[PDB]
Design a binder for this molecule. Structure first.
Ligand SMILES: O=C(O)CCNc1cc(N2CCc3ccccc3CC2)nc(-c2ccccn2)n1
Ligand SMILES: [Co+2]
Ligand SMILES: [Zn+2]
Length: 428
């Protein structure tokens, strides 16, 4: 029906700072039945100074900061045309270039005044990770309830132990009308927090995680990579497949919570800035979706930007988990991980290959394979290309000389993992 295919937007209006900090808010935002939530009056209720994220303030703060520009043809939010302008298509291609905040600002400001073109420029992926450079901005985001913050005990990304750019650091987007964010799910299905600084609106579209394989099938049919390509759903295709589509406007000061694995796309209707980062709540729902996308990525040779094995061990070492469903999932992941390390050690020892203990140091990143981008946990196959390259076991073995010239390192002895694992118990 027309009613079921156009579901109402899950919405919250905070009348007070107290309601912002209610446990009811966290349960509403993370409810699997709410794929996306818009929190009206969030900035006002928390007295957030969003002026700190105004274009004028940003220019003064770091005018020469790099902006990744996406050049796009301006089109209505429910349209994406082929080159002839006669039919709708899924692929939504852009050109990628670079400029500065100061220069993008002048373009943003000048277009805004002139309104008082066919081709537009979208200022993307602006990196607000530098804690000194963006101190007042980042400090302002400490006013949010804990579950929404960049860093918190209940956020899996706060147990990584190092920076994951754009996930546990804030990204800024500077927009003019028509600036288009193509359809996607977040890295490893992690939740996202997005605030419109404004002065104008953003239009949002979203589909429940449940339907993602159908959207992936459309992408394949229309010649674009679902996981890594740039695409814009044809709404009529979605409706013809009985897929409900959420549609709403995000006004200045409104916070959008993108729940785990929600497929979403966005278009600026006015001139505005957006800020965003990811959160991974420590729930069975989020953890399951994170691990299944982790496994699917490996099938499809796509890098998992969240190193889920590394993360699961860190969580197990420090966090008390009381939910039996989530505990079981983490416990299983850890046991599989120990077994996988063990198989590698045994085959290395059978081959007569030496393993050196390397250990871990503070702030050390998690490693990925240079050839296939898979997470490489604990047992590292290392080659000298000063410059060292890490490989997974398969790719190391595949080298023309096999393991000749490859040094194998171990970052955690069996006993280290066994002791961490044994201490990880279900909390009362
Ligand atoms: O419009 C907004 O306020 C939110 C923008 N969100 C974006 C924006 C964004 N990009 C800027 C938008 C854009 C425009 C045109 C082509 C490609 C892209 C992708 C990079 N990428 C991502 C992304 C990437 C990987 C995993 C998860 N998310 N998210
Ligand atoms: Co995104
Ligand atoms: Zn590999």
């Amino acid at each position: 029906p027309r009613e079921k295919l156009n579901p109402p937007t899950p919405s919250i209006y905070l009348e007070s700072k107290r309601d912002a900090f209610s446990p009811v808010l966290l349960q509403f935002c993370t409810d699997p039945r709410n794929p996306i939530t818009v929190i009206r009056g969030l900035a006002g209720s928390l007295r957030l100074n969003l002026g700190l994220f105004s274009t004028k303030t940003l220019v003064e703060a770091s005018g020469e900061h790099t902006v990744e520009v996406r050049t796009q043809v301006q089109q209505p939010s429910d349209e994406n045309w082929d080159l002839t302008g006669t039919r709708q298509i899924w692929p939504c291609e852009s050109s990628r270039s670079h400029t500065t905040i100061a220069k993008y600002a002048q373009y943003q400001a000048s277009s805004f005044q002139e309104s008082l073109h066919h081709i537009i420029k979208f200022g993307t992926n602006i990196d607000l990770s530098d804690a000194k450079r963006w101190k007042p901005q980042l400090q302002e985001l400490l006013k949010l309830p804990a579950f929404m913050r960049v860093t918190s005990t209940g956020n899996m990304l706060s147990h990584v132990g190092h920076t994951i750019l754009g996930m546990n650091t804030v990204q800024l987007y500077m927009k003019v009308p028509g600036s288009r964010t193509p359809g996607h799910q977040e890295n490893n299905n992690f939740c996202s927090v997005n605030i419109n600084i404004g002065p104008g609106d953003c239009e949002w579209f979203a589909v429940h995680e449940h339907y993602w394989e159908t959207i992936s099938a459309f992408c394949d049919r229309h010649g674009v990579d679902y996981l890594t390509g740039s695409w814009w759903p044809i709404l009529d295709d979605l409706y013809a497949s009985n897929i409900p589509v959420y549609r709403f406007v995000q006004r200045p000061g409104d916070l959008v919570w993108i729940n785990a694995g929600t497929v979403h796309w966005v278009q600026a209707t006015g001139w505005c800035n957006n800020i965003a980062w990811n959160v991974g709540p420590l729930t069975a729902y989020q953890y399951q979706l994170a691990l299944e996308r982790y496994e699917w990525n490996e099938v499809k040779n796509v890098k998992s930007i969240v190193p889920m094995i590394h993360v699961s061990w860190n969580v197990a070492r420090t966090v008390k988990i009381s939910d039996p469903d989530l505990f079981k999932m983490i416990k299983f992941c850890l046991l599989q991980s120990m077994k996988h390390c063990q198989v590698q050690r045994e085959s290395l020892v059978r081959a007569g290959k030496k393993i050196a203990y390397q250990g871990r140091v503070k702030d050390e990143p998690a490693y990925y394979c240079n050839e296939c981008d898979v997470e490489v946990f604990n047992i590292l196959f290392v080659t000298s290309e000063n410059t060292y390259l890490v490989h997974c076991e398969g790719c190391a073995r595949r080298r023309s000389a096999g393991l000749q010239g490859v040094v194998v390192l171990e970052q955690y002895r069996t006993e280290e993992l066994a002791q961490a694992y044994d201490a990880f118990t279900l909390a009362p």
